[PDB]
Amino acid sequence: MLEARLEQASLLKRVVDAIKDLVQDCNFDCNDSGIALQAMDNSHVALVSMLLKAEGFSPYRCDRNIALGINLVSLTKVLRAAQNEDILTLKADDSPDAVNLMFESAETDRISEYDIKLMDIDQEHLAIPETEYAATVEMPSAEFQRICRDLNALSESVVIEATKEGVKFSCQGDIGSGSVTIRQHTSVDKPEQNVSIALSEPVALTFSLKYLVNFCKATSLSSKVTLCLSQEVPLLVEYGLGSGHLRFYLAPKI
Amino acid sequence: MLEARLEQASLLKRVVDAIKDLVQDCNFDCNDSGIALQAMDNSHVALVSMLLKAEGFSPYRCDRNIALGINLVSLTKVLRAAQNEDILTLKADDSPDAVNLMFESAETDRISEYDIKLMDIDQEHLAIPETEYAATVEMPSAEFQRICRDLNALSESVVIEATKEGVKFSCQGDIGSGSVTIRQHTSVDKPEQNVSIALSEPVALTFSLKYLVNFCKATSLSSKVTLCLSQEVPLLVEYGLGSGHLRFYLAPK
Amino acid sequence: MLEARLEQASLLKRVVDAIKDLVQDCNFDCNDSGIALQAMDNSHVALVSMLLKAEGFSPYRCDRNIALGINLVSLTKVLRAAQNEDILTLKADDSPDAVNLMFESAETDRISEYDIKLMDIDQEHLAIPETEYAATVEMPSAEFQRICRDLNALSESVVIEATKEGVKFSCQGDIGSGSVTIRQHTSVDKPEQNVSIALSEPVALTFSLKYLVNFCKATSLSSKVTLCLSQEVPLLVEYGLGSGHLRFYLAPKIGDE
Amino acid sequence: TDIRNFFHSK
Amino acid sequence: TDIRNFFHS
Amino acid sequence: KRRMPTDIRNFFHS
């Protein structure tokens, strides 16, 4: 019924590690598109939107649409038993009581198999309206993670101000104030430290640093992160997965 | 008089780190062959059997049979004060209340000296019979440790099944079930990841993963581990020391 | 005003990490010679004496004498936001309510800028006299750190005995007794393991191992540490910063503990 | 503060 | 359960 | 509170 095989298991390992601390139990909706996920945290403050397109699996085969209700802590415990370079095979029958994961060793003739009992999750699906953002910032994911951790040590809220010149992350706390200003940057041989600002109108919004630090647990998935800002819409933090995406939506502090 | 000198102190450090979390207070029985240890855990489910042969000590001199009753936490605190590549000298009188430990640095002309007070431990000696095991598995110690920790995250018990094809470690829990199957594996390039299975009779037994994870704290002692199984005897997990051995015996569930 | 820039922030981060766990709130006294610090711990058993010479900053500019009262935990949180390979600029106004720190990336145009609110701290400065010590020991700082940690696992107090043979650190505890004896080790091929013992009179004093372990948080500042001892004077544990120094003074233990 | 103030259900 | 059912005292 | 004997202020003048 459902088979999705990852050529290197690392991807799923990182994907689950980028999600678990934000949302506990989730539905993996599998269809002809691949595997999608939409989940709000228990706050109802942020929203995870993940798409793993059929392109990414060795054979991807989904005979019928299926929702796999999985506890992400259990899935993390099962995925920790796989090596980054193992061959991962996910399978599920029609009307499944469990999801089957198989990890195949590259070198040795070693085979691991796990069966995770599925969950019944009522999730209330939300409609994402395909938004045009006033400001779009492309930056190194590790630099954004460092900024978020640094400012989170001082405060609970960060102001992101996007202009044509660059982006300014600022905060205020008991210690005092802090700011990191990044500028529009191009490099030829080393493009891992590039910063792009596509802007039609300056934006300035305030966000929870705890949620941004949780979002930055996706840093291992890509060397670039995209921040999308506009008034009256939530912030979009997007990590490209290669034939898919992992997106976090965060409502501003009002 | 007893003097036993180890060329690299790391060995004793790792042995005590491999024993302390399973058994706290232990007797080191010292005789002409070397330093032996036999101890059960407090719930009496597992048994530690260690032999440090005189061959491994540069001068070994044990004039009389003697029992050094040591608290392994105190010994660990003292042994942490030695470097991995230090020279260790253990000394004791014939009627001792304490043991003398000396750490000599190879390069710098540094000498550390400690006197550890001994304790009185009532000796539980058990007779371990000359067993012919139905299954004998030689595998990478790090792989066995990884399997044990992985499955211990999922369950409390592991079924070890040794058959003609290979060895299967299986477990069941509230989350679900899991299994890791290893096969006969010889390689000519990287031989540290070799797996040998000598089988005369298929075996299937159930064990506590907590105790196996505690056993795997001896991983630092050897790159290979040997598992010895039979339907009616306890599991043997053995780590070679070169000049001796460290063995864990686990009663099945 | 005050402006002083370090080409590599590492030093200040390291310096602050060697002091914060011993003393939290302190005044940084800035003048034409540079940035100095003298602070006692809350129990008044140890004393930190730091000098960061103007030599170490490429532009150093201090127009008037200024005392920056800083909470070292806050400063540590701010300094954690600097990379080891950043350009650090410390700044202060004439009548400052805060101190300004700037971290500039070497590669890229990235600028991090922080303002730490200052504190009102009355510092009780002591006159530390130019002493000629009976014993002076130069040894690897990491070796001294291991000695202190090892003996702290067994006891609360260490007896330091400096004689012509060498220097011996001994302790006694519930587990038993222990001692580490070092002798000078006149040079090697790899000279990071040298031990120097300059002695004019034997010394024997008892010290708190907790305070010495806290002192050894300066191990990251230099590969060697200097111990200075004399009967009836405090122990001096010194780490060189090059164009500056960090010194710890510890009063000997006098009790029945 | 609620994310569902920006995203309509179903 | 109980290692001592296999090894005589 | 009195100063205790282990106190660097017993060793260094004001």
Numbering used by the authors:
A (entry chain C): 1 to 254
B (entry chain A): 1 to 253
C (entry chain B): 1 to 257
D (entry chain F): 299 to 308
E (entry chain D): -1 to 7
F (entry chain E): 294 to 307
Copy text from the publication.
The DNA replication process is a desirable target for an antifungal product; hence, A. fumigatus proliferating cell nuclear antigen (afumPCNA) has been hypothesised as a fungal target for the development of new antifungals. The PCNA processivity factor is also known as the sliding clamp, as DNA slides through its central cavity. PCNA functions as a docking platform to allow DNA polymerases and a host of DNA replication and repair machinery to interact at the replication fork. The PCNA homotrimer comprises two domains, with each containing two alpha helices and nine beta strands, connected by a motif known as the interdomain connecting loop (IDCL), which forms part of the PCNA surface with which binding domain proteins interact.
The co-crystal structure of afumPCNA bound with the p21µ-afumRFC peptide was solved at a resolution of 2.30 Å in order to examine the structural features of an Afum-derived PIP-box. The KRRMP amino acids of the p21µ-afumRFC peptide fold over the PIP-box, not interacting with the afumPCNA’s surface. This is caused by a change in the sequence of the PIP-box compared to the human RFC sequence; the inclusion of a proline residue causes a kink, and the backbone carbonyl of ProXXX interacts with the Asp147 backbone amide and Asn150 residue side chain to stabilize the turn in the peptide. The second arginine, Arg143, is located close to the third arginine, Arg149, producing a loop structure (143–149). The Met144 side chain does not interact with the afumPCNA surface pocket as Gln144 in the p21µ PIP-box does with hPCNA. The Met144 backbone amide does interact with the Asn150 side chain and in turn also interacts with the Asp147 side chain, supporting the 310 helix via extra contacts that hold the compact structure. The p21µ-afumRFC PIP-box has an affinity for afumPCNA of less than 100 nM. This may be accounted for solely by the IIe147, Phe150, and Tyr151 residues, as previous research has shown these conserved residues to be highly favourable, especially IIe147. The two Arg residues can be replaced to create a linkage that, based on the X-ray crystallography structure, would not interrupt the 310-helical conformation and side chain exposure required for binding to afumPCNA, as these are 3.5 Å distance apart in the naturally forming architecture.
